Design a protein around this ligand. Structure first.
Ligand SMILES: CNc1nccc(OC)n1
Ligand SMILES: [Cl-]
Ligand SMILES: [Mg+2]
Ligand SMILES: [Mg+2]
Ligand SMILES: [Mg+2]
Ligand SMILES: [Mg+2]
Lengths: 194, 194
């Protein structure tokens, strides 16, 4: 019933553009929306976000997260390891690469989502969420060596899966960080299950 | 260590603006970013709310109530938590309960309210509160609920059992052209992983 009629470029940067979208509303009335897109999409999705489940025997399972300064936020954020997918890279491969660059951990693929939207009222940005387990008892994940790219500065924060939400709430109250909504959503469902 | 030095307006619409952000990297070097912001945020502790609406009914499995809408930035239909912007002076809880009623017809009861969490922190400063709400589906107010959607709002309600949410979402993605929201998907994954 609804669909896009046209897209007008308002402004194009190197990484981001703003467009004025005309669409037909379900009454047959024509309407406009201000829409953002990244200029980098080739791919199944713009990017991947990795849910990295650190498994060590006789320890709690942890979810491995990252903390970085995010210029659009004007502050530090706690997020799942994540990045853009390289032209002709698979989402799975992008997931293991990014996880290694940002954390130093080497993991195994458990499952991969379809493309999911980041903020669909604002942008067309999409990611695959890739669940990865990390055998924390293997020698290659003993002393994880992060190989981050140029101009990336990432701190790794591992938190127990079974207390994730309370641990996150504490980091916000204590460190004035912003937790990512996908991370928070995941944490909430862990408590809400059953 | 890191901080914002300046934010230069590139382009401002009615709803969204694009900014050139200058900030200090941790080596002590000046760098830039292209940042998106909404123009609608005033004193609110976030731009908006997303509601996690747990429909509870005697001798029924708990359902998560979701909405399906056309999203101009995406050029297609998306499945999301009920959600909207917080009106000036409105509390996040009030916004959540109001948007839930408007989008779904259901009258909820507040369970919990998250701190402000970031939508896509490498792109925008956009933030939400994630508000968990229970819906007493035995109450007569919630028997035959009707959306009371605003001007240019056109929403379908999809209630899925919490105990099978990921599979039911996957089934929906298999059968039509549409995109699941990344927060919805994250929540569904954790319900499996728990
Ligand atoms: C979405 N904006 C953006 N992405 C990547 C790099 C950058 O500036 C160097 N700006
Ligand atoms: Cl798992
Ligand atoms: Mg990254
Ligand atoms: Mg990277
Ligand atoms: Mg809405
Ligand atoms: Mg609404």
């Amino acid at each position: 019933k609804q669909y896009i009629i046209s897209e007008e470029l308002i402004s194009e940067g190197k990484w981001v553009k703003l467009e004025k979208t005309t669409y037909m509303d379900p009454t047959g009335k024509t309407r406009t929306w201000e829409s953002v897109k990244r200029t980098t999409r080739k791919q199944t999705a713009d990017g991947v976000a990795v849910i990295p489940v650190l498994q060590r025997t006789l320890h709690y399972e942890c979810i491995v997260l990252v903390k970085q300064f995010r210029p659009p936020m004007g502050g530090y954020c706690i997020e799942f390891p994540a990045g853009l997918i390289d032209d002709g890279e698979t989402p799975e491969a992008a997931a293991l690469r990014e996880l290694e660059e940002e954390t130093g951990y080497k993991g195994d693929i458990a499952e991969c989502s379809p493309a999911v939207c980041m903020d669909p009222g604002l942008s067309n940005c999409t990611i695959h969420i890739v669940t990865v387990t990390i055998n924390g008892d293997d020698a290659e994940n003993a002393r994880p060596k992060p190989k981050p790219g140029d101009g990336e500065f990432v701190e790794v924060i591992s938190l127990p899966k079974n207390d994730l939400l309370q641990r996150l709430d504490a980091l916000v109250a204590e460190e004035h960080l912003t937790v990512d909504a996908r991370v928070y959503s995941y944490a909430l469902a862990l408590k809400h299950a059953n």
